[PDB]
Paper text:
Here, we perform structural and biochemical characterization of the Legionella pneumophila effector Lpg2370, demonstrating that it is a Ser/Thr kinase. Together with two upstream genes, lpg2370 constitutes the tripartite HipBST TA. Notably, the toxin Lpg2370 (HipTLp) and the antitoxin Lpg2369 (HipSLp) correspond to the C-terminus and N-terminus of HipA from HipBA TA, respectively.
The structure of pHipTLp–ATP reveals that AMP–PNP is bound to the P-loop like in other representative kinases. The backbone of pHipTLp in the complex is virtually identical to the apo structure (RMSD = 0.35 Å), with the exception of P-loop that bends towards helix α2 to accommodate the AMP–PNP. The adenosine moiety interacts with the main chain of K130 and forms π-stacking interactions with the side chain of F132. ATP (AMP–PNP)-interacting residues appear to be conserved among the bacterial HipT toxins, implying a shared mechanism for ATP binding. Thermal shift assays performed with the purified wild-type HipTLp revealed a 2.5 °C-increase in the melting temperature (Tm) in the presence of non-hydrolysable ATP analogue adenylyl-imidodiphosphate (AMP–PNP), suggesting that pHipTLp indeed binds ATP. Taken together, these results suggest that unlike in E. coli HipA, HipT retains the ATP-binding ability independent of the autophosphorylation on the conserved S54 in the P-loop and that HipT uses a universal mode for ATP recognition.
Author numbering: -7 to 311
Write the structure that this text describes.
Amino acid sequence: NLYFQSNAMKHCPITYEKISDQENYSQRGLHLLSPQLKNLSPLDLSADEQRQEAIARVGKMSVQGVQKKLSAKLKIKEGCFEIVDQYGQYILKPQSDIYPELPENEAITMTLAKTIGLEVPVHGLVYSKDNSLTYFIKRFDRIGHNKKLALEDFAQLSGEDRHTKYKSSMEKVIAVIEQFCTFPKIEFVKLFKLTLFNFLVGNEEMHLKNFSLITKDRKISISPAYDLLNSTIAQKNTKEELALPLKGKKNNLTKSDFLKYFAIEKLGLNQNVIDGIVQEFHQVIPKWQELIGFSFLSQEMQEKYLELLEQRCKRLNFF
Ligand SMILES: Nc1ncnc2c1ncn2[C@@H]1O[C@H](COP(=O)(O)OP(=O)(O)CP(=O)(O)O)[C@@H](O)[C@H]1O
Ligand SMILES: [Mg+2]
Ligand SMILES: [Mg+2]
């Protein structure tokens, strides 16, 4: 119980809960993938081999972006992922050959998002042949018996071409929600939480194609979250804070920019709702700090994350 001459307390690469030396994952985490999943075998490819497969398969896959990714199915009885080109059930993101600790960063950041009540798909880390960690996330547009749900990103919805990521604004993002979502006021609360979250965790890369609407449960809503990571600590010499301007600003954002201009003037949220969300963030910060300390980020990357988080929290008076 003192962890002085024995392994430090181990944490699950899916849930971050305490696990024993003989376990690689917690039962709770494995069962988020499937109630019958017994284990998750390491990927039989090194990080470099995963990146090469990503390059070879990109044109055959139904998901695309800047970073290296693979599509995969979960073989439940065999207890492993299988790489596929079509009908992916999961996306796998191997280590970058450029940026440090990208899978570990995205994994913990997506977990922080879940803890503040954002809708986040099942996600986690899986070991590789070279002991490197690869990030995985469930496809939220393929459910049940390989049934596809309709999904469109905000570039498509705002009449831009498929490459437009930055030539937009948070005000245009709001306008898309107002135009298309079934219950825009509910989605505005979600966008408020997501935008504060991205500021607190250093995600300066929440671009237009990271916003999507989905048709599910007999309504059109903002999709489950994807691609949330602390991009500031993974990059060097980052100066901007927001990918898309708010009030014409991508840097030097103020508390009133978020809590008055954005929350009240642009989103129309009632003051009691704003205060309640602020209190939610205030209460969650110690849990986030604990989770970062339990994460698979290196000690040095944890310190960068915690330092930035505390700076951003001070700017919003969330302490
Ligand atoms: N869990 C998920 N379920 C369904 N679709 C997903 C998904 N995650 C990502 N996608 C789809 O794949 C696209 C690219 O995803 P993502 O943004 O994570 O790529 P990426 O890792 O290459 C980083 P970047 O955004 O900088 O290109 C998304 O816009 C979305 O259409
Ligand atoms: Mg990005
Ligand atoms: Mg992004």
